[PDB]
Amino acid sequence: DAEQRAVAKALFDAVNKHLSNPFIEVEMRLGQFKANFTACVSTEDYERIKTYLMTEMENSSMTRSVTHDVWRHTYATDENGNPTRCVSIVRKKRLFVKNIVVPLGAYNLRFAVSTETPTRLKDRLSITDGMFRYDMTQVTEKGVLMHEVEIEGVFSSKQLTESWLEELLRRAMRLATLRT
Numbered sequence: 001d002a003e004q005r006a007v008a009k010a011l012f013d014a015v016n017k018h019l020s021n022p023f024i025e026v027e028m029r030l031g032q033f034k035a036n037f038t039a040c041v042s043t044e045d046y047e048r049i050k051t052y053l054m055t056e057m058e059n060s061s062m063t064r065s066v067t068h069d070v071w072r073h074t075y076a077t078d079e080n081g082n083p084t085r086c087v088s089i090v091r092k093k094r095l096f097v098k099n100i101v102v103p104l105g106a107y108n109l110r111f112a113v114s115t116e117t118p119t120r121l122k123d124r125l126s127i128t129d130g131m132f133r134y135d136m137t138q139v140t141e142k143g144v145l146m147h148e149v150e151i152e153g154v155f156s157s158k159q160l161t162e163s164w165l166e167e168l169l170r171r172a173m174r175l176a177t178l179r180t
């Protein structure tokens with residue numbers, strides 16, 4: 001009856017709260033071997049990858065964000081670069097990691113699949129081309145400045161296909177070999 005419906009609704013809401021919304025992140029990160037794989041590119045190669053992406057872009061769209069990181073707690077920043085407050089808290093567990101065999105002269109590529117479930121400073125610029133998101137991040141994690149580039153997409157319950165993976169590897173190889 002009516003009381004039963006109130007209990008079941010509460011059980012339903014409590015179940016979903018304990019489920020959360022667990023999505024899957026598939027990413028291909030550029031990097032080098034130089035404590036082995038370092039997910040960074042040179043400054044000059046970084047600016048040329050960006051030149052490539054802005055030339056390629058046609059949707060007149062991008063997102064920039066300066067955040068502070070420290071389960072990871074992400075803190076926003078105001079107009080002067082000072083922290084505001086947490087805008088997200090997420091646990092990232094890597095499920096699958098793989099080194100890609102790249103052509104000679106190319107940047108190395110690391111393939112990573114992670115579950116994300118709702119100190120470093122990140123200045124990130126993100127572009128979308130088709131069903132792929134490009135992230136260009138300048139990271140500082142211990143006084144060291146790293147130029148990071150990755151291509152990625154997120155899935156949950158948007159499902160992952162072999163076609164999307166095939167194009168992800170194609171698009172990543174294009175950035176990895178940009179200088180050659």
Ligand SMILES: [Mn+2]
Nearest residue numbers: 027135150152
């Ligand atoms: Mn990422």
